[PDB]
Amino acid sequence: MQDAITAVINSADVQGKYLDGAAMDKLKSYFASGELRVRAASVISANAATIVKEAVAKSLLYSDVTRPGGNMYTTRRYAACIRDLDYYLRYATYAMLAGDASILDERVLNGLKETYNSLGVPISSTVQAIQAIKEVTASLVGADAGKEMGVYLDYICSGLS
Amino acid sequence: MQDAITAVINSADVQGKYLDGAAMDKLKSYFASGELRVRAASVISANAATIVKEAVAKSLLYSDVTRPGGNMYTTRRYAACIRDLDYYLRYATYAMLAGDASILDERVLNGLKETYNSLGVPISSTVQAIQAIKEVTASLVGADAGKEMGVYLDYICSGLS
Amino acid sequence: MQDAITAVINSADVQGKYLDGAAMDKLKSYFASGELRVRAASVISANAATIVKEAVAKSLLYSDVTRPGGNMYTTRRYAACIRDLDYYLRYATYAMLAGDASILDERVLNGLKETYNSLGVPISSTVQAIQAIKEVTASLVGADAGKEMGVYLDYICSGLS
Amino acid sequence: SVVSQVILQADDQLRYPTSGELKGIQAFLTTGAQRIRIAETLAENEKKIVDQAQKQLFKKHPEYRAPGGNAYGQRQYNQCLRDYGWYLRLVTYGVLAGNKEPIETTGLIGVKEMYNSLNVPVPGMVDAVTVLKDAALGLLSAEDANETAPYFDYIIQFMS
Amino acid sequence: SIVTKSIVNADAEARYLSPGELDRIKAFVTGGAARLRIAETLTGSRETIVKQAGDRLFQKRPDIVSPGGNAYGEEMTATCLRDMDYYLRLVTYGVVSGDVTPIEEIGLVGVREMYRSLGTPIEAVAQSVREMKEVASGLMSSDDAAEASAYFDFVIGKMS
Amino acid sequence: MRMFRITACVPSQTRIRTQRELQNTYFTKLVPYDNWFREQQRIMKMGGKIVKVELATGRPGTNAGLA
Amino acid sequence: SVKASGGSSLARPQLYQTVPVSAISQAEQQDRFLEGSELNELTAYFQSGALRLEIAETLTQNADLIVSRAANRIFTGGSPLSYLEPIPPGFRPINIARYGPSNMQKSLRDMSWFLRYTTYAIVAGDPNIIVVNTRGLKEVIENACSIDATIVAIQEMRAASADYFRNNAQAKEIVLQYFDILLSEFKAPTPANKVRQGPSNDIQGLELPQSYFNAAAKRQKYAMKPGLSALEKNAVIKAAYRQIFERDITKAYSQSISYLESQVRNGDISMKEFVRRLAKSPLYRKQFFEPFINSRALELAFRHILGRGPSSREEVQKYFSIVSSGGLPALVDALVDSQEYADYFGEETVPYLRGLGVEAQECRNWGMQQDLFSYSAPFRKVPQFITTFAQYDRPLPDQHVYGSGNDPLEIQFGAIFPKETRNPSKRPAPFNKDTKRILIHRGPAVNNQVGNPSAVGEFPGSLGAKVFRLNGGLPGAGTSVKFGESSTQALIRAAYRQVFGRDLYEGQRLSVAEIQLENGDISVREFIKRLAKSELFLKLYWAPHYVCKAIEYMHRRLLGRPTYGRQEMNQYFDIASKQGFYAVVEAMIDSKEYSDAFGEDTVPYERYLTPGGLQMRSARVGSLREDIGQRVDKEVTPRFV
Amino acid sequence: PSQVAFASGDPIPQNVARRTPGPSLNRFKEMARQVK
Numbered sequence A, B, C: 001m002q003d004a005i006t007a008v009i010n011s012a013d014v015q016g017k018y019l020d021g022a023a024m025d026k027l028k029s030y031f032a033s034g035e036l037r038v039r040a041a042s043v044i045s046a047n048a049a050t051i052v053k054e055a056v057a058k059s060l061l062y063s064d065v066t067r068p069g070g071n072m073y074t075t076r077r078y079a080a081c082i083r084d085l086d087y088y089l090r091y092a093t094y095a096m097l098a099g100d101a102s103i104l105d106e107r108v109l110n111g112l113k114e115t116y117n118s119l120g121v122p123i124s125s126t127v128q129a130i131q132a133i134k135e136v137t138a139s140l141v142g143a144d145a146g147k148e149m150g151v152y153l154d155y156i157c158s159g160l161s
Numbered sequence D: 001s002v003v004s005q006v007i008l009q010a011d012d013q014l015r016y017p018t019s020g021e022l023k024g025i026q027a028f029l030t031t032g033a034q035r036i037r038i039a040e041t042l043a044e045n046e047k048k049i050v051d052q053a054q055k056q057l058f059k060k061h062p063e064y065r066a067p068g069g070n071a072y073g074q075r076q077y078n079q080c081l082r083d084y085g086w087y088l089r090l091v092t093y094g095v096l097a098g099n100k101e102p103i104e105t106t107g108l109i110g111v112k113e114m115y116n117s118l119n120v121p122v123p124g125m126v127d128a129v130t131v132l133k134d135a136a137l138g139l140l141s142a143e144d145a146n147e148t149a150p151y152f153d154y155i156i157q158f159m160s
Numbered sequence E: 001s002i003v004t005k006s007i008v009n010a011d012a013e014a015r016y017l018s019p020g021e022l023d024r025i026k027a028f029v030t031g032g033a034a035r036l037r038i039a040e041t042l043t044g045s046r047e048t049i050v051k052q053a054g055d056r057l058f059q060k061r062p063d064i065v066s067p068g069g070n071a072y073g074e075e076m077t078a079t080c081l082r083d084m085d086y087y088l089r090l091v092t093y094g095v096v097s098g099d100v101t102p103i104e105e106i107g108l109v110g111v112r113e114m115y116r117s118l119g120t121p122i123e124a125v126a127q128s129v130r131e132m133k134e135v136a137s138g139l140m141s142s143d144d145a146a147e148a149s150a151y152f153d154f155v156i157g158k159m160s
Numbered sequence F: 001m002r003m004f005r006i007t008a009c010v011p012s013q014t015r016i017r018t019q020r021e022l023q024n025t026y027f028t029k030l031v032p033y034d035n036w037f038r039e040q041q042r043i044m045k046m047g048g049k050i051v052k053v054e055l056a057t058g059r060p061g062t063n064a065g066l067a
Numbered sequence G: 001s002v003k004a005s006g007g008s009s010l011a012r013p014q015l016y017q018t019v020p021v022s023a024i025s026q027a028e029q030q031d032r033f034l035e036g037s038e039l040n041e042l043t044a045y046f047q048s049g050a051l052r053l054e055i056a057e058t059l060t061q062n063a064d065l066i067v068s069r070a071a072n073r074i075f076t077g078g079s080p081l082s083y084l085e086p087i088p089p090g091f092r093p094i095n096i097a098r099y100g101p102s103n104m105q106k107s108l109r110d111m112s113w114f115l116r117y118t119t120y121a122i123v124a125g126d127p128n129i130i131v132v133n134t135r136g137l138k139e140v141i142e143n144a145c146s147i148d149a150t151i152v153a154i155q156e157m158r159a160a161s162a163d164y165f166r167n168n169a170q171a172k173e174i175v176l177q178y179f180d181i182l183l184s185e186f187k188a189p190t191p192a193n194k195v196r197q198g199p200s201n202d203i204q205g206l207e208l209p210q211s212y213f214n215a216a217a218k219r220q221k222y223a224m225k226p227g228l229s230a231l232e233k234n235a236v237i238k239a240a241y242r243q244i245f246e247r248d249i250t251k252a253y254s255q256s257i258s259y260l261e262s263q264v265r266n267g268d269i270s271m272k273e274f275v276r277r278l279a280k281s282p283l284y285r286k287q288f289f290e291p292f293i294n295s296r297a298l299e300l301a302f303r304h305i306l307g308r309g310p311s312s313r314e315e316v317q318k319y320f321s322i323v324s325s326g327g328l329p330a331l332v333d334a335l336v337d338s339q340e341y342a343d344y345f346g347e348e349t350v351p352y353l354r355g356l357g358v359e360a361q362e363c364r365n366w367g368m369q370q371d372l373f374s375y376s377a378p379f380r381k382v383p384q385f386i387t388t389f390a391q392y393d394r395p396l397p398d399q400h401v402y403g404s405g406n407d408p409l410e411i412q413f414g415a416i417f418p419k420e421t422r423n424p425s426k427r428p429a430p431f432n433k434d435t436k437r438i439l440i441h442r443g444p445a446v447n448n449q450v451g452n453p454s455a456v457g458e459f460p461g462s463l464g465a466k467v468f469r470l471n472g473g474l475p476g477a478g479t480s481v482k483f484g485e486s487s488t489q490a491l492i493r494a495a496y497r498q499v500f501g502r503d504l505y506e507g508q509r510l511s512v513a514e515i516q517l518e519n520g521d522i523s524v525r526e527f528i529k530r531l532a533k534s535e536l537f538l539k540l541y542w543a544p545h546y547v548c549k550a551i552e553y554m555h556r557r558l559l560g561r562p563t564y565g566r567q568e569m570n571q572y573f574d575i576a577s578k579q580g581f582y583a584v585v586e587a588m589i590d591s592k593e594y595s596d597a598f599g600e601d602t603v604p605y606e607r608y609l610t611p612g613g614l615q616m617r618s619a620r621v622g623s624l625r626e627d628i629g630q631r632v633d634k635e636v637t638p639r640f641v
Numbered sequence H: 001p002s003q004v005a006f007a008s009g010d011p012i013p014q015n016v017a018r019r020t021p022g023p024s025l026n027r028f029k030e031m032a033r034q035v036k
């Protein structure tokens, strides 16, 4: 991946110059927000499975998606969808702790959209499940870290769409 | 791959014909210039690293390519680029010895252009570096072998572009 | 592997001495016998199938070895045995060309007994078949070249005992 | 930075980072003020640091500027000064990041390959980095010098 | 050819041709004249070689030209002589190339399943090549005959 | 057995330090469904860029008759 | 100390390349006879050999003068030749007095060494030795040796050496080319080491100097590409079969999977996918999965797919879990999809055995990987990596000091040892001279002589073996029906069963010894000594065995116990070296412990067992006691009854 | 034809010199130079 700190360092390096105060303010801001990010990551880690179950119940269960004819029908495909959501939550947590969306563009949105198109996995339903994940984690973590995690979940959502 | 002699063998085979005069004389011509090929390949091998050094010196260095923002900036990029040039010189030597450019197409120019485009390696400056290699080797091995090697170096360049 | 030149050079070098008279004597003997050894190797390569056929006919066929309960009985075991005979011929040729039995030590006699004792291949029958191969090759290449190949075939045979 | 290292280690095992990794992240994210001031102090003093380092090196290796030497000629000399400055910039990058990754990805991997192709001796480069280390640490407080020395040591260790 | 094989092995080890390989190819290029002379001798009298070898084959294997035989009749005998001419042409290709690469690529790779699908006894084809080798050896000098016999015997071995 | 046809570029990240020979890194291939998740994760963890993926073998939304 | 050994076999890295080795290895790595290419190289090299030896002769004869010219051009202010063991701008002559005697010696030695290795390279027909030992010498000697000075010395040596070859452009060109290679390689900067990073946290990272790689035999690498000729694709597929199946089973047995080969040569599947599907195939299943327990199968699979053996305890643990869960497909998928596989072989390259010379090697799996890479690996069934890795982490095993093969079966009769080559099972462990093997007494545990040294000779009663003693009087010490005939004969036959394991066939008994014992002329000890020294004992138990196997079996029969360690073993083995079989028997039966345990009237008997022997006897279903190694629940009638 | 004999030919014994005290005995060598 590619952190916010390393993002500032990379912009400086590509310019070939030292890190000016204008770019050093971004570094200071990221340094300040360490405690919130680490706490949010710990909270999410302690409750990942519960988050996924709650989001699935909110967004997917008792719908045509999970009835016969829906991609979430059958046991194996249900488990595959749950695994996808687990990976999404973990990678969103990674990007939140990093302060950058590069890991999402690198290890999530890399051939995933076209894989889903090939398999006919409904993009809208997946985005809905990610929105439910966002709501559950925000309700579990807080407003500030909730929004700053919803940014990265939204990055994933807009990449899939 | 195929050599210049396998080339004429194949040309005759497609017609089911024995080797006639127009094929025998081409085999004679290849066997007449083979000694120069052996000598030129020996010289190039004896000075491959220096050839690549001199080619890079008068083509890429002290340019925006090696400046920050240029695709040769950073030690890893520079090392990779010179390694690519080493490979190009060696493969052009192979084709020179064989008298044919089939090896270039089958073991150099297959996914190379796609790989560079995915990576962002500048094709134009790659071509310029290879042209500098052509100049250096021509000055090192003599006009005849120099031209007969620049043929294959240009083949690589045209394949990349 | 090591050839005769490597053996002589290492003997000279471990003592820090230039190539002396005895070393030069052995090296020039190697170089003088080289052309006829190459010719013998070419002849053997051109007749490997016939050599193995005749050796098998002389030594193995129409015996307890090829009948039910014999180690060569089934078709798979027969094919494996003639393949092993081809191995022995090829590596004897390697040893002859190299002018040293090191290839036989590191590529053949390493775990030859492991393999054959584990599979229960009859050692005496193998030695008889290799002696037949030596006799057939001698009849085909000549008495002196036959002796040159026979030293190495006997080396494998004694390794089997 | 250490955050990226933690995330890489966690993803390689397909798990959330453990408690210890997050605690290390917290400690690093707290020492940021010292890292930032070290980076700034080294930044504005690039010229003096490079001047001391280069005079020391070319006192150590007069051959480099001597005829037939790699640095002989104003162009080559200026490129060497450019290299001093660039590696000092890399050191500041590493100090800010909290690890050697910005240094290593930019100016250590393939560095021998590059300088061999330019006939700049790698031992010349390690001596250069040593003198640059001495000069730069001379311009820092004791604690800041202790903090920023291991980055110079890492460049030195990689160089040879 | 020899050049192709040497280059392929060099590629397999990702290295320039060694001085020994440059020497083997030097010898190959020098012997090009003799091998071309042999190829010219073979191609000049291809018709006589084919005719005599086919007649000798029919003498030695009467069943092939009998009812229930693959070559039975005028047309099938004509195609059998055509195959003999094909293989002599491939032998000339091998002679000029100094290697059996053309012969393997054109005539021998998957030859057993080719003739098995036609109901042709492969041993008889090997015998026909043997007769062609005999006639060709009778048609030129012994020193040239050995070099031609190497490739003839390669064809025979890949058919026996 | 469903198969994905995938086109991807996966440059080596260790070539300079290992000095191992250059290899073609841009490839199109068929990967079985059962390994495509691991393969995709591996490629993206390499720094690779997946260019195109299609369902070469199989049909979308099939419940029975996979192998 | 270390608690286990993976074995140690002779390692022969290539020091440098020569033309015959190059050609013969080129043919041999492809499993074929030398063809026109390699044979032609050999012919040309052999033809040039006479000239090459002429060059070497002239240079060795005049090496003194060439080195002297170099030393005179390079040094100033004295005579460099007082003790023998184009111009760079910075060159300046070096002062002998200032430069120092040690460094002057190294200068002269290096010049002579350069000329010597140049002659070596001339004879070998390859400059590889020069490149190997000269690329990076500069940086090795910059700080104590002038590079300009060395360059000028080499140029002077080159000129002087070529001066002897006005013959024609045959000798001169070769000398000049080899000296030019030497010059350009001495001028070369040191290349970076090849780094083999650990694929995970349980495997260490390593690096190898590039000179080591340059010397070693180069591994031929096969890569499937769409544009290759058909013959090249055939060679690549054959290489894939040789790698995965350890030999060309298509050539040997016509075994092949045709559709997989068509797919891979078309580019439908990559070489990686081809490897995955081939290793899952019933051919591979039958050859390298069905014959083996999973523990050995995974080691073979690591050989076939990654070109290396397991690297650590954690790795074998992880992959044995994988094969336990999902069997062969799971194992193959995990190996092929590993980051390590893609790091080395990618999508196109056929996997290759890495091993010594190709990259930096680890000490921890050295011997095991040596064994694994042998073509005899399929015939080792006992796992070698899990066993050795586990034994690293644990104390020394219960095992003979010289290895597991030196432990015979603890059966009634027969000297049965594992054969080193038959189903290889060797388990070397480092027992130093002072270890003592823990033995299990056949009798009351507290009578073990370790804890109770005065218990020696205490008969074990019902807990141990039957003991035969000549306690009763001997007959005739006339009348018939003298009862002292049955006991003495029972003791004689017991002694035969003790020394030989079982009774002899008719005509084999030492009748003279028997009558001489029955007449009170000798003691029981003397009679068993005669039995042990008998030619029959020699033929049966001494002659057919490794010396130390014979000694160990002897010790078990005569002292009723295995040897404790290296002290007893070494003394008997040394006697075997010096005196021979009869003296070894004498030493065993005249030893103090024999006297203590057995007097002049007691037939020896089994007094101790190894843990392995006792487990063999007492761990079978019909002999295993109910209370051993399990919870014994007391059964009580239910309270409601 | 008989020239082919190298391994089957008459062996050519090579000179291998008996090893002698190396420089690690230098001090004792000096002592040996001062013991007469």
Ligand SMILES: *[C@@H](C)[C@H]1/C(=C/c2[nH]c(/C=C3N=C(/C=C4\NC(=O)C(CC)=C4C)C(C)=C\3CCC(=O)O)c(CCC(=O)O)c2C)NC(=O)[C@@H]1C
Residues within 6 Å of the ligand: C060, C061, C062, C063, C066, C067, C072, C073, C074, C075, C078
């Ligand atoms: C008529 C059937 C064809 C024919 C046969 C033929 N075979 C041989 C010799 C051998 N045949 C075998 C075959 C097998 N042994 C096995 O164990 C198995 C599987 C059970 C098979 C199929 C073997 C091993 C031999 C070697 C002889 C031996 O027993 O040691 C011959 C003799 C060939 C010769 O020249 O010696 C013959 C004649 N031949 C034809 O032409 C018919 C089409």
Ligand SMILES: *[C@@H](C)[C@H]1/C(=C/c2[nH]c(/C=C3N=C(/C=C4\NC(=O)C(CC)=C4C)C(C)=C\3CCC(=O)O)c(CCC(=O)O)c2C)NC(=O)[C@@H]1C
Residues within 6 Å of the ligand: C065, C070, C071, C072, C076, C077, C078, C080, C081, C082, C084, C085, C087, C091, C107, C108, C112, C115, C119, C121, C122, C125, C126, C129, G247, G375, G376
């Ligand atoms: C005829 C020679 C005798 C005979 C042979 C026989 N061998 C096997 C099986 C194998 N032989 C080998 C040997 C080698 N493989 C190598 O790579 C080399 C080094 C150059 C050697 C020497 C091996 C490894 C095997 C098994 C695996 C393989 O196929 O490669 C068999 C089959 C045994 C079986 O029971 O399956 C046989 C029959 N048998 C005789 O009776 C002849 C005297």
Ligand SMILES: *[C@H](C)[C@H]1/C(=C/c2[nH]c(/C=C3N=C(/C=C4\NC(=O)C(CC)=C4C)C(C)=C\3CCC(=O)O)c(CCC(=O)O)c2C)NC(=O)[C@@H]1C
Residues within 6 Å of the ligand: A061, A062, A063, A066, A067, A068, A073, A074, A075, A078
């Ligand atoms: C009854 C024996 C036990 C039980 C059942 C139970 N299940 C759910 C909810 C779901 N069950 C499934 C399972 C399947 N759907 C399929 O298509 C198939 C494949 C043929 C299976 C096996 C699913 C997907 C759901 C989610 C809802 C949905 O299908 O839309 C519930 C309610 C869940 C909840 O808590 O809201 C229950 C009660 N519960 C028990 O305690 C019994 C042991």
Ligand SMILES: *[C@H](C)[C@H]1/C(=C/c2[nH]c(/C=C3N=C(/C=C4\NC(=O)C(CC)=C4C)C(C)=C\3CCC(=O)O)c(CCC(=O)O)c2C)NC(=O)[C@@H]1C
Residues within 6 Å of the ligand: A065, A070, A071, A072, A077, A078, A080, A081, A082, A084, A085, A087, A088, A091, A107, A108, A112, A115, A119, A121, A122, A123, A125, A126, A127, A129, F033, F034, F036, F037, F040, F041, F061, F062
């Ligand atoms: C769940 C919210 C939705 C859903 C999911 C679903 N996905 C698949 C199959 C796959 N999903 C992936 C995705 C990824 N691979 C990665 O490496 C990552 C990056 C972190 C992701 C997100 C892949 C590659 C596959 C195919 C390979 C495999 O499944 O192992 C399925 C099953 C499809 C099928 O036909 O079996 C399902 C059900 N489906 C829905 O309807 C939800 C909206």
Ligand SMILES: *[C@H](C)[C@H]1/C(=C/c2[nH]c(/C=C3N=C(/C=C4\NC(=O)C(CC)=C4C)C(C)=C\3CCC(=O)O)c(CCC(=O)O)c2C)NC(=O)[C@@H]1C
Residues within 6 Å of the ligand: B061, B062, B063, B066, B072, B073, B074, B075, B078, D064, D070, D071, D075, D076, D077, D079, D080, D081, D083, D084, D086, D087, D106, D107, D114, D118, D120, D121, D124, D125, D128
């Ligand atoms: C100075 C301490 C030493 C020295 C230096 C020297 N360097 C060059 C030329 C180049 N140096 C670089 C370096 C880098 N590129 C990168 O990406 C990185 C990481 C950020 C580094 C450090 C490059 C690319 C060049 C060539 C590019 C160009 O020409 O612009 C020279 C000149 C060499 C010449 O002219 O051939 C010199 C002299 N020399 C010494 O003696 C010191 C040890």
Ligand SMILES: *[C@H](C)[C@H]1/C(=C/c2[nH]c(/C=C3N=C(/C=C4\NC(=O)C(CC)=C4C)C(C)=C\3CCC(=O)O)c(CCC(=O)O)c2C)NC(=O)[C@@H]1C
Residues within 6 Å of the ligand: B065, B070, B071, B072, B076, B077, B078, B080, B081, B082, B084, B085, B087, B088, B107, B108, B109, B110, B111, B112, B115, B119, B121, B122, B123, B125, B126, B127, B129, F010, F011, F012, F013, F015, F022, F023, F024, F025
């Ligand atoms: C040098 C003149 C220019 C340059 C080069 C450059 N290339 C890369 C990366 C790669 N180049 C290759 C090369 C090949 N692939 C093939 O199949 C063959 C055919 C024989 C060749 C020559 C590959 C495979 C890579 C990827 C890395 C790997 O080794 O696997 C880079 C690095 C790009 C990056 O982002 O790291 C560079 C710098 N760049 C220039 O600007 C020069 C004009």
Ligand SMILES: *[C@H](C)[C@H]1/C(=C/c2[nH]c(/C=C3N=C(/C=C4\NC(=O)C(CC)=C4C)C(C)=C\3CCC(=O)O)c(CCC(=O)O)c2C)NC(=O)[C@@H]1C
Residues within 6 Å of the ligand: G258, G259, G260, G261, G262, G263, G265, G266
């Ligand atoms: C025969 C009627 C015609 C013909 C055939 C022909 N095909 C090829 C090459 C290939 N054929 C295939 C097809 C398959 N491979 C498979 O595994 C399967 C799936 C079960 C199929 C259907 C493939 C993949 C190839 C390419 C790789 C390979 O050669 O195996 C050739 C050779 C082409 C060449 O240029 O070498 C030929 C001759 N050709 C005709 O003219 C007939 C009309």
Ligand SMILES: *[C@H](C)[C@H]1/C(=C/c2[nH]c(/C=C3N=C(/C=C4\NC(=O)C(CC)=C4C)C(C)=C\3CCC(=O)O)c(CCC(=O)O)c2C)NC(=O)[C@@H]1C
Residues within 6 Å of the ligand: G293, G294, G295, G296, G313, G316, G317, G318, G320, G386
């Ligand atoms: C259970 C009744 C007893 C017991 C078992 C136990 N086993 C292990 C570890 C291993 N067991 C195996 C077994 C096999 N390998 C094979 O190939 C097969 C043939 C199908 C078998 C059964 C192996 C290989 C291991 C090692 C696994 C690893 O690498 O970790 C343990 C754990 C040992 C350890 O140190 O982790 C245990 C506990 N133990 C008892 O006490 C029971 C009597």
Ligand SMILES: *[C@H](C)[C@H]1/C(=C/c2[nH]c(/C=C3N=C(/C=C4\NC(=O)C(CC)=C4C)C(C)=C\3CCC(=O)O)c(CCC(=O)O)c2C)NC(=O)[C@@H]1C
Residues within 6 Å of the ligand: G411, G412, G413, G414, G415
């Ligand atoms: C007879 C039905 C079969 C047979 C037998 C046979 N056995 C041997 C050799 C030995 N037998 C033993 C057996 C034992 N030792 C013990 O301690 C026990 C329990 C008391 C037993 C059963 C041993 C150890 C040997 C080897 C030592 C010795 O023979 O004294 C042979 C001779 C083998 C040889 O040449 O060494 C034979 C022939 N053979 C058959 O074919 C029958 C099916």
Ligand SMILES: *[C@H](C)[C@H]1/C(=C/c2[nH]c(/C=C3N=C(/C=C4\NC(=O)C(CC)=C4C)C(C)=C\3CCC(=O)O)c(CCC(=O)O)c2C)NC(=O)[C@@H]1C
Residues within 6 Å of the ligand: G438, G439, G440, G441, G444, G445, G446, G448, G450
């Ligand atoms: C006691 C805490 C536990 C226990 C012990 C127990 N041990 C045995 C038997 C033996 N103990 C040993 C041990 C050693 N011998 C040595 O030389 C050394 C090295 C100094 C040691 C540690 C041996 C070898 C034996 C076998 C008999 C012999 O002494 O020669 C027993 C008896 C087992 C039986 O079935 O008779 C017991 C009970 N048992 C427990 O439950 C305790 C936890």
